[PDB]
Amino acid sequence: MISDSMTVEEIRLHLGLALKEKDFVVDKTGVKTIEIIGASFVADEPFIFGALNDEYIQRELEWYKSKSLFVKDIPGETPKIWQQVASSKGEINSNYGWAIWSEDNYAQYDMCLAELGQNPDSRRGIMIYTRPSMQFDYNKDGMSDFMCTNTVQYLIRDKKINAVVNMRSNDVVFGFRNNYAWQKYVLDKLVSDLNAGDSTRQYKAGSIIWNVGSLHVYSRHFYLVDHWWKTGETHISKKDYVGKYA
Amino acid sequence: MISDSMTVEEIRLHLGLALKEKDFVVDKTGVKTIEIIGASFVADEPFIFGALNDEYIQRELEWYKSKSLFVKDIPGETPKIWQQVASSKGEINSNYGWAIWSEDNYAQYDMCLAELGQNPDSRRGIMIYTRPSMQFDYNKDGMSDFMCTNTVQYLIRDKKINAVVNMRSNDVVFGFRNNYAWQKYVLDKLVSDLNAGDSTRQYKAGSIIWNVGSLHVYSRHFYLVDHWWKTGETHISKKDYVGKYA
Ligand SMILES: Cc1cn([C@H]2C[C@H](O)[C@@H](COP(=O)(O)O)O2)c(=O)[nH]c1=O
Ligand SMILES: Cc1cn([C@H]2C[C@H](O)[C@@H](COP(=O)(O)O)O2)c(=O)[nH]c1=O
Ligand code: NA
Ligand code: NA
């Protein structure tokens, strides 16, 4: 039994209610947010609010395939957000290709693939992204990057592979869209690798379940929530939005 | 906004449905289980099925206060389960007092207390129990102890301190009852320590939210589920149970 969770549509609704309520909490940067504490839902759409950007996602995936911990190695011009959280030397913590494909984080992908190839029913098929020393590593050399993804667990049931994603913190607009594309790519690769190992397995991709301690919208994206609250459209250009949260 | 989750009562219901359905999955030990994948609920009662045992809980808490990684240091006679998962030398991984009070796991309690004493609104107040090297450490010296608790996050909102518990795996009957008593003790201590630091804070304990990749019942406890399914009583002695799952 997979848990019958909220869907992306219902998360949209609860965010709209928080905004209507004026239930604000002060970000570390001083900015207001709206927040769901302890959120859990099935990721049945590839975005919550906003639009897709295959070009950027493909650049972030090439960076993950390189496993580099330096933001300059992102193909093309590196985004400003990555520059602002990096150390004095351009270093970060959150390269998810490093987290799952590097020997330095204990070969999470290959060990999860070996565990499930040996025991398809296991509860120990997991890729652990964060680490206890994060209590001190988050601000090494002046960076500001406390890992947001804690763990991802994989469970094979009825010839489908399901993923359970646990995050400390996730931005609804950019974070969720990029992080979802990545989790789906990893899931499909794992399915294909298991199938090439044994042509009788015939596995397929299953569901992705999303769990978050603080799932939040920054006040700079309140307009998307408000517009969806009024119209049902999940995207509008900032230039075209008319409404209070300009 | 805390997420409006299932309660313990509703978890009881879904477990009863899995049992009725005969939706079984094979444990590593060969035994059948029933399972909810990706479960998330508020812990508003101190047990799901079964009875309380303050004596045993108090012994496990004294062991946690000692921080010892050896099962013999549990006060009095050490339980058989702890003996069966221990290494050739009596060693385990899962002492939660070690995980949060030892310098060797990077002082999780003291660093979370310092983070929240400095910024009550933070999203980085977390105690990280597991670690990436668990892909290799789970069977060190022949033990069988892949850490079950991944992380616990603390969020202070409206002068109440809420906890978000993330677990890979949890047994509904013994695991949940013992693990809940522990999480509530830590929460109350944190509240009291914050209040003694500043007599204007006046904080109080809030909600505990429980998230689990595989939340399961072993076939040896199917009787409790069945009895509750038939009668609404959350406990019965194994001697008194009449029914199929004898
Ligand atoms: C690196 C990363 C950051 N974030 C966002 C979540 C938070 O808004 C922010 C981290 O801020 P915090 O460490 O104060 O929670 O970055 C994601 O949503 N996904 C990611 O993968
Ligand atoms: C140490 C510990 C184990 N357990 C149970 C969960 C599983 O039934 C078992 C670990 O088995 P697994 O590693 O194969 O999932 O021990 C808890 O529920 N809580 C705990 O704190
Ligand atoms: Na670049
Ligand atoms: Na003992």
Q: Which residues pair with B127 in a beta bridge?
A: B152
Atom of ligand 2 nearest to the CA of B144: 13
Query: Ligand 4: distance of its center to the CA of B96 in Å?
Result: 17
Edge-to-edge strand order for the sheet containing B32-42? Answer: B25-26, B32-42, B204-218, B160-171, B149-157, B126-128
Mark residue B197 as left, alpha or beta (left: phi above 0; alpha: psi -120 to 50; beta: remaining).
alpha
Give the one of A34, A35, A131 whose C-beta lies nearest to B128's C-beta.
Answer: A131
Residue keyed to tokens 């496990």: B60
Residue type at A195? N
Distance of CA A193 to the CA centre of its chain: 22
Round the CA-based radius of gyration of chain A to a whole number and report it: 19
Q: CB–CB of B40 and A108 under 8 A?
A: no
CA dihedral A7, A13, A14, A15 (to 10 degrees): 110
Which protein residues have a CB closer than 5 Å to ligand 4 (ion)? B 72, 74, 78
Q: Which helix (H) or strand (E) holds A227?
A: helix A222-231
Q: Which of residues 53-92 of B touch A (CB under 8 A)?
A: none
Question: Which method resolved this structure?
Answer: X-ray
Residue A83: how many CB atoms within 10 A of its CB? 11
The length of chain A in residues reads 246
Helix (H), strand (E), coil (C) string for chain B: CECCCECHHHHHHHHHHHHHHCCCEECCCCCEEEEEEEEEEECCCCCCCCCCCHHHHHHHHHHHHHCCCEHHHCCCCCCHHHHHHCCCCCECCCCHHHHHHCHHHCCHHHHHHHHHHHCCCCCCCEEECCCCCHHHHCCHHHCCCCCCEEEEEEEEECCEEEEEEEEEEEECCHHHHHHHHHHHHHHHHHHHHHHHHCCCCCCEEEEEEEEEEEEEEEHHHHHHHHHHHHHCCCCCCCCCCCCCCC
Please provide residue A182's backbone torsions phi and psi, each rounded to the nearest 5 degrees: -65, -50
Rounded Cα gap, residues B103 and B98, in angstroms: 8
Q: Are A213 and A37 in contact (CB under 8 A)?
A: yes
- B30 interface with A at CB cutoff 8 Å: no
Q: Are B226 and B243 in contact (CB under 8 A)?
A: yes
In sequence order, what E strands does chain A have? 25-26, 32-42, 126-128, 149-157, 160-171, 204-218
CATH fold for domain A1-246 = Thymidylate Synthase; Chain A (3.30.572)
Tell me if residue A112 falls in helix, strand or coil.
helix
Tokens in use for A52? 């897709």
The length of chain B in residues reads 246
Tell me if residue A9 falls in helix, strand or coil.
helix
Most B CBs within 10 Å: which of A37, A136, A159, as the mutation test of the B interface? A37
Q: Name every chain B residue with its beta carbon within 8 A of the beta carbon of A135.
A: 106-108, 111, 128
Ligand nearest to the CA of B70: 4
Please provide residue B218's backbone torsions phi and psi, each rounded to the nearest 5 degrees: -75, 150
Q: Name every chain B residue with its beta carbon within 8 A of the beta carbon of A133.
A: 106
Q: Are B71 and B83 in contact (CB under 8 A)?
A: yes
Residue B80: how many CB atoms within 10 A of its CB? 7
Q: Are B135 and B180 in contact (CB under 8 A)?
A: no
Atom of ligand 2 nearest to the CA of B94: 1
| Nearest CA, atom 12, ligand 2 | A123
Please provide residue A37's backbone torsions phi and psi, each rounded to the nearest 5 degrees: -90, 130
- List residues near ligand 1 (CB under 6 A): A 28, 94, 146, 148, 169-171, 175, 179; B 123-124
Q: Which of residues 223-242 of B touch A (CB under 8 A)?
A: none
Ligand nearest to the CA of B122: 1
Atom of ligand 1 nearest to the CA of A216: 8
Edge-to-edge strand order for the sheet containing A160-171? Answer: A25-26, A32-42, A204-218, A160-171, A149-157, A126-128
Half-sphere exposure of B37 (CA within 13 A, CB side): 25
Give the one of B28, B157, B169 whose C-beta lies nearest to A119's C-beta.
Answer: B28
Instruction: Give the DSSP per-residue string, A52-110.
Output: --HHHHHHHHHHHHHT-SBGGGSSSSPPHHHHHHS-TTSB-S--HHHHHH-GGGT-HHH
Angle among Cα A37, B18, A126 to the nearest 5 degrees reads 55
Residue B88's alpha-carbon distances to A10, B74, B168, in angstroms, are 50, 17, 25
Query: Ligand 3: distance of its center to the CA of A71 in Å?
Result: 7
Q: Which has the closest alpha carbon to B213: A217, A210, A44? A: A210
Q: Name every chain A residue with its beta carbon within 8 A of the beta carbon of B122.
A: 28
Q: Are A69 and A95 in contact (CB under 8 A)?
A: yes
Q: Is B94 in the pocket of ligand 2 (CB under 6 A)?
A: yes
Check residue A117 and report its DSSP letter. Answer: H
Rounded Cα gap, residues B13 and A4, in angstroms: 13
Q: Which has the closest alpha carbon to B23: A152, A43, A3, A164? A: A3
Sign of CA dihedral A30, A33, A39, A44: negative
Q: Which of residues 189-208 of A touch B (CB under 8 A)?
A: none
Q: Are A150 and A129 in contact (CB under 8 A)?
A: yes
Residue type at A64? Y
Q: Is A119 in the pocket of ligand 2 (CB under 6 A)?
A: no
Q: CB–CB of A23 and B17 under 8 A?
A: no
Sign of CA dihedral B227, B232, B235, B239: negative
Tell me if residue A32 falls in helix, strand or coil.
strand
Tokens in use for B80? 């058989």
Residue ranges covered by each domain of chain B: 1-246
